[PDB]
A paper describes a structure:
The transport of the CagA effector into gastric epithelial cells by the Cag Type IV secretion system (Cag T4SS) of [name] ([name]) is critical for pathogenesis. [name], a unique protein in [name], regulates Cagβ-mediated CagA transport, but the underlying mechanisms remain unclear. Our structural and biochemical data together show that Cagβ functions as a dynamic hexameric assembly.
We crystallized the soluble region of Cagβ (residues 166–748; referred to as Cagβ1) and collected an X-ray diffraction dataset to 2.8 Å resolution. The protomer of Cagβ shows a 3-layered overall architecture similar to TrwB. Residues 631–658, an extended segment between two α-helices in the NBD, form two long anti-parallel β-strands that stray away from the NBD and constitute the bottom layer of the 3-layered Cagβ. As in other hexameric ATPases, the NBD makes a major contribution to the inter-subunit interface for the formation of the hexamer, resulting in the placement of the ATP-binding site at the inter-subunit interface. The asymmetry in the Cagβ hexamer structure may reflect its intrinsic dynamic nature and ability to carry out sequential translocation of CagA through the channel at the middle of the hexamer. The central channel in the Cagβ hexamer runs continuously from the cytosol end to the membrane-proximal end, spanning a distance of ~100 Å. Strong density is present near the Walker A and B motifs in the structure, which was assigned to a sulfate group from the crystallization buffer, mimicking the binding of ATP to the nucleotide-binding site. Our structure of the Cagβ hexamer shows that no arginine residue from the neighboring subunit is present near the ATP-binding site of the NBD, suggesting R241 in the Walker A motif may fulfill the role of the arginine finger in cis.
Numbering used by the authors:
A (entry chain B): 181 to 307, 335 to 351, 355 to 406, 444 to 745
B (entry chain C): 180 to 306, 334 to 379, 382 to 391, 395 to 411, 422 to 431, 437 to 457, 464 to 742
C (entry chain D): 181 to 307, 335 to 412, 421 to 461, 464 to 747
The structure:
Amino acid sequence: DDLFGSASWETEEKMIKAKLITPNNKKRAFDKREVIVGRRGLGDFIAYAGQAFIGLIAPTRSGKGVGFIMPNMINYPQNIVVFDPKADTMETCGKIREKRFNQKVFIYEPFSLKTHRFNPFAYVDFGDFSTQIFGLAKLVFPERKDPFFSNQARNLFVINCNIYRDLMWTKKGLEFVKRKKIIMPETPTMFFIGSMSPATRNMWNSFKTMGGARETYSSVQGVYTSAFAPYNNAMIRNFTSANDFDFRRLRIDEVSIGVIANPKESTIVGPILELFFNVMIYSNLILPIHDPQCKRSCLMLMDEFTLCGYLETFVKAVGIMAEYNMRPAFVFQSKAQLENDPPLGYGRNGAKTILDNLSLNMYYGINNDNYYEHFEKLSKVLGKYTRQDVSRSIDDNTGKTNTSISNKERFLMTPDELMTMGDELIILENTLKPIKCHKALYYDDPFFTDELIKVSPSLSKKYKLGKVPNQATFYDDLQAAKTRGELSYDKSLVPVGS
Amino acid sequence: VDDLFGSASWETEEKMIKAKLITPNNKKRAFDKREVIVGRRGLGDFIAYAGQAFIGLIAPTRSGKGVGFIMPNMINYPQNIVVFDPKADTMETCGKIREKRFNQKVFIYEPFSLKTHRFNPFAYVDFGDFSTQIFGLAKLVFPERPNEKDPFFSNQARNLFVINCNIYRDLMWKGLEFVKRKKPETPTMFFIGSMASGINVVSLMEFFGGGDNLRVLSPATRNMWNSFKTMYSSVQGVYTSAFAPYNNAMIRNFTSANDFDFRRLRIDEVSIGVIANPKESTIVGPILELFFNVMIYSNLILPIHDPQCKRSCLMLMDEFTLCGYLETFVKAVGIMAEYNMRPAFVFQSKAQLENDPPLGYGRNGAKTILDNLSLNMYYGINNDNYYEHFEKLSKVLGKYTRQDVSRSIDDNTGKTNTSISNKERFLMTPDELMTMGDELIILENTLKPIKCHKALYYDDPFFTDELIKVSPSLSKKYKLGKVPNQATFYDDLQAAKTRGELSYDKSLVP
Amino acid sequence: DDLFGSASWETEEKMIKAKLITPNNKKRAFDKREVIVGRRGLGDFIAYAGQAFIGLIAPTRSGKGVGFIMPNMINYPQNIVVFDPKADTMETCGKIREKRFNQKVFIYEPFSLKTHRFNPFAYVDFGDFSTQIFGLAKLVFPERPNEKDPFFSNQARNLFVINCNIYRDLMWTKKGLEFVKRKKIIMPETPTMFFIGSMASGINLKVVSLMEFFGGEEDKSGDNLRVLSPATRNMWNSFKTMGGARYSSVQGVYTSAFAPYNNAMIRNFTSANDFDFRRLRIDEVSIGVIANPKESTIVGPILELFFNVMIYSNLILPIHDPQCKRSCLMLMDEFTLCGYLETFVKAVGIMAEYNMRPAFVFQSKAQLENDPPLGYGRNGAKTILDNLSLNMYYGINNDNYYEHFEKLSKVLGKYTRQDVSRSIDDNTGKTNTSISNKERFLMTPDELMTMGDELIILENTLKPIKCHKALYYDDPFFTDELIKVSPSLSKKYKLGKVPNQATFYDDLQAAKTRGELSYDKSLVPVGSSE
């Protein structure tokens, strides 16, 4: 009966048809670039294939790292770009990325000398020219009681880059600079642009265009400098000092990219991460049919996504990124933090645009009164099924009994039941009925601890491969081995600046 | 038939027949009312919207908007179509169908490719209507500024465009006397982008004009410049920034000439595909704005005023939110219906439509567009972010009366008792709508809710028959009239698209 | 029993007592200026008498024209002021208004040269004056809730009034005419808004500034200041102490307040005043306003004046003047399209006893509650809605309107129904029947959304009414008047019979394109810019 609802968990057959599991799931090949989202037991995983996007609504300290980030870091066989704010994911899985999958590891730490460098001017064709320049200016000066001037500063950056362009990629400009009057580089950086032929005739007309420098140079220059100020920092200047990896090969070479950043601790790094992700996403709108070399997939483990702030590039790109095998999995504390106003959010409709492009959503549960509303909604989303309710009557004189059966409604999962799942989680796929499963714990499964023990001598002496490690001492020995860099990526290839 | 708990019910067959969505013999329906397929009740048993009202399809991702709505009407619609094809699959799959089935000329506008087509907004002027055209394009190129650094510049740049167009009509018409002064006549965008430096760079207040050319150029042709000399560098900068996208060879080739007369969009049997991804290339925004402006406004004449414009044209606005800010549709959907310009908008959610005007249409613009959709299709997906959307939909379907049975046993003996009662039940609960799968809900403004199946094209031989009889690679493997094998039809169709044998006439496009 | 509710539909009794219907309703005389709002059958109408105001909450494409506007356009025997943004209502009922009611038809299309003109300065007695001038100034220069810098708008309004006093003391004085003739001052007779705005640059001779012509370097002898009145001179001194020191920002906002009048169409529409709005309740006239403020914000303020002067020119009791016995039904069709018109918010509560009877037609209560830019604000929307005593509600099956109908469902209330349950011994076959009482919505939300061509009428002093739309195209009560007017409709369709429903609307559009159902356009003045 369905009078009081028809809610139900998804069947094993439909999950097989959706390719989430296989008939012999414990012996599955993992040959469809699948992302592990849950487990039915040790080595019996639920994994998402295809190109659809994953959302993980994980409260603070709910186990997103040990149940999603670390398992896929250890298992996923294609390219990975992971957000690593605590500098622990890469420190734990880099040796696996390099030894098991044979992938070069690039670490982008803008607030440290030891980092790989990214320069956006390495992605322009100095010699659709000015399109990249205008997009870069839009990134440098964001669109927003004080209009104009900022647009004049964007024009200042426009003909700034145009001036440096004319200064090098011209045959006479080479001699003009060979007069030894300026010290411009061979390839420009953002700091250098900030410190600074009929198209150049129009550029001179722009040098006398709206008169932005006539009795109004002070304010325009002040806004320009307030925008270019992040590059007065030595760490940021070193981060933009060069470009070590070409993002146009993110789907060609076998690479793993970690980003160690924190814009909440310092609002300065915001625009640099914005530029970084914009160039990374916009360097791969080439279909594998048009470029047969771009065959690999790039899983983007956007851990601590809401900590990144407003990245409008994602809002504009999520709806078209899927077919290019740029597959992000967003992990945010809660939806409420996502919809917030631009400064620390994406707006209501922008967050809705991002969330509409997620086809698999994992829901962890914690018993916190601050997450009630959310979980309540989740309860209502799972719907109700029909249940039998038994009542009894007894004649107090004779003692005979009467049993009555009626139908009632029951939530598939009540709010407090959702809040007290512990290590269980709910999976909602767009085309499937709700699923309940266990977190793919990495430290509990030999499926991942074997890979962790393989590449480390200490764990190899302590624990045997294939056996579940002694839970009372495994994590501590893993930490002790991480202190000596046994699990970390080889840090000798990470460049160091002055 | 009890309405004690509401009277919610699906629309009856009789009322659907009266609404021309189906016929008394729907399997043998002739499709003679220019109907748009919006779902099926079975193999070849389709529900089809007649009339002139507009369709809206709220189809999320991984929902089958193309395979359930775009592809079937592409195979089936007998009149003219204008499809938005950003992924290059719809046209590359149905072009040979539009060509061979309905004898229609396929015209593909892919600005970012050599094999493209050409659109010149200048071929739409009365070479009393030339001044009207000048004012029209001046309004279409200079929009109203609610908050600018100054509205005076906006109005003055509109007036500068108008006066420059008047002077250009003056010089290009005794137009041959000045031709013999120096060493094309059909204007293009970035050659009009040079219409601010000079004849080639003469001064913007001298040259051979105003001197004393108030009478050399017919009254107002050189008179407005005498009055607008107060009420050049920044003006040239703004004009060059406006015309700069034309400097790209792609857009340059797009606006180099014109191979189609949009005033004949309802005359000749044609099919217009548009390949564009403004989310990737953000520069095509204003360009597509002018494109659709001239495509729609050049068709705003009633068929009673010109019966030669007899054909209808369905605008399959697939990925409508992708187009960006197309204020044409915001200002036009309220009057287009009576002109046989019939759009069907396809979008992922209401929120994506309500996005801010730069990347969406705004709340008020989204409401203005949604208010002109009389038939609304609802595909279901099990996504928490859509709960509020489907719950309301559930509430819109209503409640009906159902029977509730309670049994009671006398344990000492075993004799039983059955008791029935009436209870309320939502016609469809929110979580039931969320898990419809291949089903969908149609809401027509003047009808009761309709539930049906998605009109899939690979499922039904109603469409695979055409796709097979058209391409030679599929005719050998599969036969007509029979539903082909589901395990190998899609891959064979992919492979047929690889060879282009199921595409269209690529040789024609410039 | 009323334990679970007592909601019910109004009986034929109370409707008769409310004068909404009569005993011989089919043969009703229509002698109490009634507005048709519904029907219980072909030619069996529900019609509102009295002076109360009507509201029609009709979603888009829900039949407000065919069910309300066009029926009363055909039937209403008194004066009609209709809003016709699509120019279709007039095009369909003009010759009915003219031939059946002998009413002169005026057309106000501020974007077609074929239009009648309106000039607010024609409603001012120059040679009382201060009150009307200040009212017109507050109309052109309205208050702002921003309050961050209202002094500039105040001084711009002071400049407007001052310019008006200067014009009055120059063109309606005795020595001012001699002064203008001696110094060759370009100044027209009856003033227009365009000229009052152009006076910001200065007095036309070229043109020199006001600060120069009066008390400046151009007025060396000081004679040009003496020609003005002492009150105007004191106001000019006060303004020179106000804006004239440290004016540059006042002239900008002043010239911006007259920017719509740099347009040629608005210039022609303002140049004259064809119809006297003080005659709206004496002569038999029918006025059609063809504008669209959403298509162009320029006509926004113009309409604001146009309607305002129309209302306040008709605030006279019939005991003051016995010529004002004619009522004026104001078919405010597509009301929110007119944007924010303060005159309606301020005047809905006072224009009822003047026989200015508006019927507001809007798509939803939420769109009317929109903020001043595109609506009236919550408080203003409530103010307008509080003065509507008969509200018609159309239904459509559209989720965007669900919250509107749920509430309406709740407004209709619940009633008590009987519910039967059955039991049965599964062995002996003996059964049991039980009856209880339950509650039932008079109309569930989905029932209202699927009402089709039925509607709900809520009158302030009655119980809910459910009736059928007063469709004109299927009722000989209206098609008789529409076929009596067109020769070919008379050649095809017979009077007193329901026309062929498959072809009547199409043949009607055909006859309309030939202008047979339209007003005589020969009497509409035509201008030209030169």
